[PDB]
Amino acid sequence: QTMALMVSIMWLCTQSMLENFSAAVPSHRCWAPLLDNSTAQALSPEALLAISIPPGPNQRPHQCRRFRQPQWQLLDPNATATSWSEADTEPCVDGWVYDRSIFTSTIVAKWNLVCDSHALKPMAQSIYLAGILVGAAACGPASDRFGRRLVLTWSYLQMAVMGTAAAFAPAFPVYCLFRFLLAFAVAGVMMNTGTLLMEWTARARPLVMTLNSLGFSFGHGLTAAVAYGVRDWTLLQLVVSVPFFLCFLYSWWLAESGTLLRMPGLRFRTCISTLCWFAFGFTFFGLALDLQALGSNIFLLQMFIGVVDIPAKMGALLLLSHLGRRPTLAASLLLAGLCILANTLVPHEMGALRSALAVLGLGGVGAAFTCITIYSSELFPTVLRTAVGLGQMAARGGAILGPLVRLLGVHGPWLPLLVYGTVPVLSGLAALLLP
């Protein structure tokens, strides 16, 4: 039944989207005796916060620097503000503290993922995406030798185990290994679902593809509701991996008891296919893992994209079945690129338009993925359509560089968004050349 796998793919989106909710960075500041010690001191907490922490970006108190001595210059109204020296700051010798405003417990507050060592979150995202990448390649021969159903049940068991274990990870490398194994199992489940849905009924390939895509997009609203319900990342991972226990228990019928040579050239087809897959994967896994910076509220943005991705994909399927594959794919790619470029150009003051443009770009890249998945079954002969596997591998490899590009934010907050807007434009400009 397609319902059982559709539910699993829905929770698979939840497990994939948990990389953004669990790695959320709430408002944090360094430990200070004027704010964290006893109230009896030798009033006005904002003044103490200002005199204890030097200002940083967006006129906010810095998150990785603290004054070695109380700077009373920010207290006297007649004093010249913004005139202290750099030597009066210390590299946070007393640690940091976290405010439980939007989130009460995350992996950032546990292992101290402050901006001083902010590379740990993109590194963990890249490790998860590498586990997704190597998961599809290794599960190929595993499903070919052991069978798709047995390895599917084993991947469900591994998903449950690594979900119940990641919530109890005491160290950062242990959590990274748990996420790697979880991503391996996720990639195995995805490959099995893909190889089963294609050979299920298919002329009915686009219908089942759109159904699976809608079941996956339901995962956005699912994880939004779960993150609005529970606020602890451990309890979140637990309740997200709980349904996979029943998914594994669904085994045994509910307790019954191809290589090619491209020496002359790229032949104008596989190069463009891999380029579009790379672009889709890169923009998707670079824009979905940083939803906190794309809108004012993470849950609101998630609900918005979850409620907009369904009619967007419906219209994408409509244009795919009504006016072809290449023109609608190029149009969706260009629309997503222009939307991300406008989101980059629009200042951070207008949050509503920013969230709308981000939702439109995500819908556009989803429509482009749907089109390139429908187009992958027609651009190659019946025996060459290895092509879909190569395209998925190229998309995963492009996703690998997704979180790594976000590290370029030290030079400017718009450069990652600039790339996320420029890549779809070139992808759509190159998509028009498809036969």
Ligand X SMILES: CC(C)(Sc1ccncc1-c1ccc(C#N)c2ccccc12)C(=O)O
Q: Is 366 in the site for ligand X (CB under 6 A)?
A: yes
* Interacting residue with ligand X among 10, 108, 166, 190 (CB under 6 A): 190
Smaller CB distance to ligand X: residue 53 or 197? 197
Q: Which of 289, 399, 419, 423 binds ligand X (CB under 6 A)?
A: 399
Nearby residues of 426 by Cβ (< 8 Å), 6 or more positions away: 279
Complex with ligand X: residue 92 or 162, whichever CB lies closer: 162
Q: Which of residues 44-103 bind ligand X (CB under 6 A)?
A: none
Q: Which is nearer to ligand X, 153 or 274 (CB)?
A: 274
Stretch that binds ligand X, among 95-103, 202-210, 243-251, 389-397 (CB under 6 A): 389-397
Q: Is residue 223 a contact residue for ligand X (CB under 6 A)?
A: no
Judged by CB under 6 A, which of 5, 291, 336, 395 binds ligand X?
395
- The 3-state secondary structure of 6-75, one letter per residue: HHHHHHHHHHHHHHHHCCCCCCEEECCHHHHCCCCCCCCHHHHHHHHCCECHHHCECCCCEECCCCHHHC
Q: Can you tell me the distance from the alpha carbon of 420 to that of 298, in angstroms, rounded to the nearest whole number?
A: 19
Min dist. Cβ of residue 257 to ligand X (A): 32
Cα separation, 20 vs 25, in Å, equals 9
Footprint on residues 4-33 left by ligand X (CB under 6 A): 9, 16
Contact positions with ligand X (CB under 6 A) in 114-133 = 132
Taking the least distance from each CB to ligand X, the nearer of 184 and 284 is 284
Q: How far apart are CA 167 and CA 37, in angstroms?
A: 30
Give the side-chain half-sphere CA count within 13 A for 116.
17
Whose tokens are 């060459």? That residue is 384
- Nearest residue to ligand X, using CB? 395
Query: Using CB under 6 A, which of the segments 22-30, 117-125, 225-233, 395-403 binds ligand X?
Result: 395-403
| From candidates 213, 234, 241, 283, binder to ligand X by CB under 6 A | 213
Q: Which chain residues interact with ligand X by CB under 6 A? A: 9, 16, 132, 190, 213, 216, 281, 284, 366, 369, 392, 395-396, 399
